[PDB]
Write a protein that binds this DNA or RNA. Structure first.
Lengths: 100, 111, 50, 48, 116, 143
RNA sequence: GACAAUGGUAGGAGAGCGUUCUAAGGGCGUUGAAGCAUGAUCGUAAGGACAUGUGGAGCGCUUAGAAGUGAGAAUGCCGGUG
RNA sequence: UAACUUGGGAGUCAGAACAUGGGUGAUAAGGUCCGUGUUCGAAAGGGAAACAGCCCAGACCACCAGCUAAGGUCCCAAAAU
RNA sequence: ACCGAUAGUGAACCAGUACCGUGAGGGAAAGGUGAAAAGCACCCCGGAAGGGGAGUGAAAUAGAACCUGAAACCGUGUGCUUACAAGUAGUCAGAGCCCGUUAAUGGGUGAUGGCGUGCCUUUUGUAGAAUGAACCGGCGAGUUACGAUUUGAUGCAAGGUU
């Protein structure tokens, strides 16, 4: 069985023992997290519904908390002598689904 | 082992020597010698002397048998050109590049 | 006319595909032992014997 | 201490350098606008 | 004092010639063609980072429309029924269930048929 | 992040057979094209073909509504100056109907390297019998 | 911590990176300086490091000062090479 | 939520199409000259096949999340045979 | 708080010289082995040039076409891919095959799908068949003196200062 959790303005399909990379959370490396919003559990014998299966809090652990790799945002306008360059690294946290 | 021999600032354009170096690259040694002997091209004797030099270094400089060697490498690099002129019509004058070349040959016994 | 535009070293290297020479078309003389051109005389010490 | 000097705050400024890049906004035309008599090395009109 | 401008121009012209490698021919060797190509590449990446999010929603919409016709619904009727039932799974998750659990897409389609 | 992408190893293609008797040209063609592009499969990946093979029997029975046997001319140029040949859609059916259906259906497939490899899975015969019995072609009903 | 704002030419305002030289302080170097080649590193940008090869003796860091201060385009000058 | 006064610093004085009130032309012109509004100029994104100026709408950066505007839902091509 | 061999004299070199002009007159370009010539005795291929050794040397890709040695350009070998296809040559998604790093959501190649008419200048408006550039490297454009005015700083203050 799997589950569907809503974390960062997105849904995610999680199974036990899977490593996920979600948006930044305020939990610290080594701790454990608990996802409340769960839209669909099961996939072996029990199905459920929504907007929220009242109960069924997935339990994970905070594996790492880091930053993606830099993407350079460069754009220009032809013949107008206007250009611009930025650089970006989006932070993330990596978790591991312990138990659904 | 490999033996090698070079001939520097041969006075022939490099892309005229690369035409006949491509016929003997890979062949045996006594076959490449006859190929260089029986070809019409003007750069045949020069490559033949460089090949015989690399075949002679093997007998004496590093002892090995000359009936087993194969031409492992043979190439021609550029060298310093010469800048001459040719006076054409109406006062003009056009350039002339006298190219040179560096012919290298490496013979190996496959070991 | 003049070339409208420069030639890549891809187009040049393609067009020099068939620009080459061939192996002299030679046999081995059965008197000199050495190599020779077929239908020509043995340039080494020897003759034709055709 | 000659290895630790600081001017009074607000006493020094960077001069401005035209003709060096488009990020500055003064690199091309050097703040002189497009073609005219006021855009020519030399200058404009007598004052007044 | 005179400044001879040495070692500064090459270091910034070489950062671009290596930021364009793989490019066909002179576009990875020369500076004035590699620079224009890298500028165009930056603008293209900017545009494609935003077209990607629409391409993938079209892909999900096609798979969920192909999965719903096997239960005799349209895609629009299935989505209307799911909205009314109050189920809020996104198209990305709905396509994944449709592929890896048909016994769960059956449940979703039954609820969306009963919601009218 | 989590979108399944079809690969050549995963693809399992089936064979269908459709009856083009008593049907309209364009209405049959659009559905056969949707079957050939593989938009009828939940595992549909845009970059690689997941479509099925189709066999269209009885091509001589497709019909046109209205005065289409004399109108609906088909034009084609030969690239030589002046040569623009034509054939009405009524003389093409009685002569070579299997080209009629083939061109109709292939005008609805994208013109890309993959839009040809997807369009060469269509086998059109005018007449009830087809050689491809060794492929076990299921019998598909248009809707 | 809450709320908003952030397209842009000409051009106006602000904050900055880097180059050569000088003063004062604190350092590195034949156990290998600068330069130069490669790399899968860091910074919001200009740009900053580190490792390896080479090379063969000089060179950075901090705080201030002064400028022959940063170039893809002028049918630009000179040299080389297609 | 602006406005005005005083001072330092500029650029601008070749405009364009569309809708509407007019002159001129032949109730011709992608014509020309004026009043009024929009957009382009200096504006990317979606639609109009393509397409400065037309319709919708103003990009701080990232996301393999959702709702809509003009316009659309047989296939090319997302959504009603 | 002058230049450092495209700079500084036109000239760091046997330069106002090769040269070029009937003449008056115009005018370049050319630096660097090593601490010490110790500047390769001798053997081998070749007619010689040129090598390959072996020796000098701390170093010979230091061998007089001598410090370093880069880019365009010219080659040799190879890992992945390419002969039914309409290409501003990339970007986004993505199998397969080959590797293994500044260890991190790794590097190389790219079957196939979507989107996509270079840069600068000048314009109401240019993908434009309007202009400029063959490519690479070096050089190259708002500055200094003396006055005026406004702003920031600092010292004194009915006084301020040569």
């Amino acid at each position: 069985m799997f589950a569907i959790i809503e974390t960062g303005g997105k849904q995610i399909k999680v199974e036990e023992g899977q490593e996920i990379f979600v948006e930044k959370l305020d939990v610290n490396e080594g701790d454990t997290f608990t996802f409340d919003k769960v839209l669909f559990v099961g996939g072996d014998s029990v199905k459920v519904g929504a907007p929220t299966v009242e109960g069924a809090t997935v339990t994970a652990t905070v594996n790492k908390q880091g930053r993606g790799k830099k993407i350079t945002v460069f754009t220009y306008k032809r013949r107008k002598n206007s250009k611009r360059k930025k650089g970006h690294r989006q932070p993330y946290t990596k978790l591991t689904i312990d138990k659904i | 082992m490999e033996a090698k021999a070079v001939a520097r600032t041969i006075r022939i354009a490099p892309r005229k020597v690369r035409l006949v170096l491509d016929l003997i690259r890979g062949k045996n040694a006594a076959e490449a010698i006859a190929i260089l002997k029986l070809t019409n091209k003007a750069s045949s004797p020069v490559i033949e002397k460089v090949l015989m030099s690399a075949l002679a270094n093997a007998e004496h400089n590093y002892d090995m048998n000359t009936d087993e060697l194969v031409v492992k490498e043979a190439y021609a690099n550029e060298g310093p050109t010469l800048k001459r002129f040719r006076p054409r019509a109406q006062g003009r004058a056009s350039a002339i590049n006298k190219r040179t070349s560096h012919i290298t040959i490496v013979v190996s016994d496959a070991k | 006319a003049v070339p409208k535009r420069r030639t890549s070293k891809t187009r040049k290297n393609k067009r020099r595909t068939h620009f080459k020479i061939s192996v002299p078309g030679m046999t081995e003389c059965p008197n000199c032992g050495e190599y020779k051109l077929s239908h020509r005389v043995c340039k080494n010490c020897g003759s034709y014997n055709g | 201490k000659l290895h630790e000097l600081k001017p009074a705050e607000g006493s020094r400024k960077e001069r401005n350098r035209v003709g060096r890049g488009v990020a500055t906004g003064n690199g091309k035309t050097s703040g002189r606008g497009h073609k005219g008599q006021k855009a020519r090395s030399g200058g404009g009109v007598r004052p007044g | 004092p005179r400044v001879k401008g040495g070692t500064v121009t090459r270091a910034r012209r070489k950062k671009t010639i290596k930021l364009a490698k793989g490019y066909f021919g002179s576009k990875h060797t020369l500076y004035k063609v590699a620079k224009q190509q890298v500028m165009k590449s930056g603008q293209y990446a900017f545009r494609d980072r935003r077209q990607r999010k629409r391409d993938f929603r079209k892909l999900w919409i096609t798979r969920i429309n192909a999965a719903a016709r096997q239960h005799e619904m349209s895609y629009s009727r299935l989505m209307n029924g799911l909205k009314k039932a109050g189920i809020d799974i996104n198209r990305k998750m709905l396509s994944e269930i449709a592929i890896s659990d048909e016994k769960a897409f059956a449940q979703l389609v039954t609820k969306a048929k009963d919601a009218l | 992040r989590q979108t399944f992408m079809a690969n050549e190893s995963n693809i399992e293609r089936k064979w269908y057979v459709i009856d083009a008797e008593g049907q309209t040209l364009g209405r049959l063609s659009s559905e056969v094209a949707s079957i050939l592009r593989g938009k009828n499969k939940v595992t549909y990946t845009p970059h690689v073909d997941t479509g099925d093979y189709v066999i269209v029997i009885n091509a001589s029975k497709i019909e046109f509504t209205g005065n289409k046997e004399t109108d609906k001319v088909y034009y084609r140029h030969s690239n030589h100056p002046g040569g623009i040949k034509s054939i009405t859609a009524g003389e093409l059916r009685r002569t070579n109907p299997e080209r009629l259906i083939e061109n109709s259906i292939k005008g609805m497939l994208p013109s890309t390297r993959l839009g040809e490899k997807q369009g060469k899975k269509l086998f059109v015969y005018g007449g009830a019998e087809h050689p491809h019995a060794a492929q076990q072609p299921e019998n598909y009903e248009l809707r």
